[PDB]
Amino acid sequence: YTTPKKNKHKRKKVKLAVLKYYKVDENGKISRLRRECPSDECGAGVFMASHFDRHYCGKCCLTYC
Amino acid sequence: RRACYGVLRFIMESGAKGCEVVVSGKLRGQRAKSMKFVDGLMIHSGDPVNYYVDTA
RNA sequence: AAAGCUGAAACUUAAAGGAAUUGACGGAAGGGCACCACCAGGAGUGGAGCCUGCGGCUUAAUUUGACUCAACACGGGAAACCUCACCCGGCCCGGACACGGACAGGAUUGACAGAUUGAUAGCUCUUUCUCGAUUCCGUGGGUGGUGGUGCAUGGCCGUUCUUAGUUGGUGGAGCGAUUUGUCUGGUUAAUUCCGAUAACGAACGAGACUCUGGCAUGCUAACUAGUUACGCGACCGGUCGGCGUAACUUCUUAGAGGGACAAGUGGCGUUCAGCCACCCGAGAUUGAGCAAUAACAGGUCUGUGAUGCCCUUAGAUGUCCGGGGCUGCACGCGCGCUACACUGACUGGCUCAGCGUGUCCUACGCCGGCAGGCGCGGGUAACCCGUUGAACCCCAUUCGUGAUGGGGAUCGGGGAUUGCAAUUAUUCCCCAUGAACGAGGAAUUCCCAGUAAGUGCGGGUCAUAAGCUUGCGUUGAUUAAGUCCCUGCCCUUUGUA
């Protein structure tokens, strides 16, 4: 072959990812750090992503600037 | 030999006019051979063959 | 003199040889047979253009099986993608099951954007989101294949081999392989019969048989077939596939049953099997299907969930997606189609089919020169297409022996239909271009009466679709009723190292 080898994409292993979603204060202020997905099924169950310059939902594929 | 002869003896005992049992392939060794065994009467040609002999 | 008589060895070898049995073969003989053989001819093919299938030479690949009959329009093989094996490049697991590790403090799944790519393929990179023990990593073990081997195989299939061939039982003859039966002679398409007879009884093939053509003014029947008659109507007793009732089955469909058996007459035939002629008749040989014993190292693993071994199996020979190729052309062969014209082209008029197919076959109306475009109907079909108004042919017109109004190859423009997609042009239409070809050298194929040949139509392939094959009608001959000369076949004698 001319190419050296084509390697499969391995998912970058992140430890305890849902702790980055909430920021709980001492007296108890449960603030959502990531924005909520405004679509029907996602509502209150799916926390839409926050990229460097955009938002993104992994389920419904909804995007905002 | 014994198996095929067993079938002949039983078919002729049951009351057939005649029987023909053929076994073909690697019977002995690495070369393909055929062994035909015949008894009674057996017709090959014409319309009667259709409705007098049955084959499998 | 030529030579005669007497006469070794070294070395080398598992046979050399004798009689007789089956085959096969013979430029040996005796009978008979076949248009894949000739004779008499018919059409041809081999020469030309073009279509297709093969070799070669090219290429990244031009996937490949098959090479006398028994390969080469064959693989039902008319390949744009698929098909698809081949070449270039890229996704996917659709790696069951088991054992170990991993692991809800998340094994893993999918993906917006930008980059990337031929691709809006989360394929991969950056960046985060999202699914929830279904997976993911190791070993064992599977599962795929149009991967290999038809010379490991099964099944079909072709051929030997379209001729009349083939084999036990008991008896007879040989030490035996083996032979007789299975035959001297007549006779038949026939190992088909008669009759001889160390054989007698049999079995398969042949025949019988089944389907199809040809005859029934007899039989049973019919608004999904027609006739005859009558009524009404249209137009001059006549024409009507103009419509509605009554007798029916001649015509049409198709069940039953009849009919042809060398039966009758005359010859010839050991007055036997049978042969030739003739009367009466629709017919005195219609065309097929089915086809034994014993074999091809015949073809097919690329028909199969028919299959043994072997090769690969996750950067796959699995599977899928984009392209390209199968068609690539200094050449040589094999099936074919159109022609070379005047018995013919062209233009107009006239008038007849049969097989069989339609959930895609199409009538009718409108628009376009045409290919076709719209609209609205019938038919799952003796019901609608359809009375299947088919072509040669028939009757008029123009042409005039000129490579010409023969022939239409090759080439330029346009205009439509399939399809996601038409370029290396899928088919289709229009205008233009107007090559070889003046009947084909050696050679060689097929064929005996509704045959050869001319001529169209339907089926299979089929989204698009016939220069192919498989069927059907239509017009319709010349020559022969023989032979073993060539090429082969069957039986009997012999000869063989």
Ligand SMILES: [Zn+2]
């Ligand atoms: Zn969402």
